[PDB]
Amino acid sequence: NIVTVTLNMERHHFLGISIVGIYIGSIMKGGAVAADGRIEPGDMLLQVNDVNFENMSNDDAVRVLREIVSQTGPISLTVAKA
């Protein structure tokens, strides 16, 4: 089950996720992801905007998320539900 979740990123500064395939390791208080509710811990992160996460190292995925969260605009996260 694959779901795409688009977040406006206007009411919250950060996603509020940790990443540990790349999985959502945790969802944190105060982030856009927790407020939205559609993504859950354990979901597998497949794509963020136009960046596919296949074969990506954890360090590179953190760098990608940092760069995307730092730029203004919506963020679309495609996950496979746990």
Residue ranges in contact with ligand E83 by CB under 6 A: 14-17, 28, 30-31, 62, 65-66, 69
Q: Which is nearer to ligand E83, 65 or 79 (CB)?
A: 65
* Nearest approach, Cβ of residue 49 and ligand E83 (Å): 13
* Nearest approach, Cβ of residue 40 and ligand E83 (Å): 15
Whether residue 7 contacts residue 75, with contact meaning beta carbons closer than 8 Å, is answered with: yes
d(CA 70, CA 44): 22
* Nearest approach, Cβ of residue 42 and ligand E83 (Å): 16
- Give the 3-state secondary structure percentages of the chain, helix then strand then coil, rounded to 5: 20, 35, 45
Q: Which is nearer to ligand E83, 3 or 25 (CB)?
A: 25
φ, ψ dihedrals at 23, nearest 5°: -115, 150
